[PDB]
Design a protein around this ligand. Sequence first.
Ligand SMILES: COc1cccc(NC(=O)N2CCC[C@H](C(N)=O)C2)c1Cl
Ligand SMILES: [Zn+2]
Length: 139
Amino acid sequence: SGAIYVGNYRVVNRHLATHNDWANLVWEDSSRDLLVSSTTAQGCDTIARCDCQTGVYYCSSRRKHYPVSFSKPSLIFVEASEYYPARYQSHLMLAVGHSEPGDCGGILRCQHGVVGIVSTGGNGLVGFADVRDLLWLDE
Ligand SMILES: COc1cccc(NC(=O)N2CCC[C@H](C(N)=O)C2)c1Cl
Ligand SMILES: [Zn+2]
């Protein structure tokens, strides 16, 4: 679990969005596993606007932060799950690191701010949904 709180927006994994997220929907994209909902309170986070390919993520299944080198946002095949059919997920960045299904929502940050959130995992892999291209989150 986990979310990004920026301005009057809450960014979550689409597959983990609550009834309240959907009732206050701003934007969602199944191909990116992202959903953004509106909030009444002002958020605690700031978004990176950069091309960093290294950063640190929070891994809830280890209660620890790990440094990672990750690929540029791209279209990657993701196997079927209870949440989605087998498909290509866009704007996804992969890295070598530990992840378990409940780790989704963990934040990846670089020196400039929030880069994205954990969205996939594999045998020694972790995938992050990028949010750096969503410029409207800042206004
Ligand atoms: C060790 O295996 C791991 C580790 C961490 C996460 C995952 N689950 C995914 O990757 N899924 C399921 C949820 C939905 C995701 C999606 N974005 O489609 C895909 C797995 Cl299989
Ligand atoms: Zn950066």
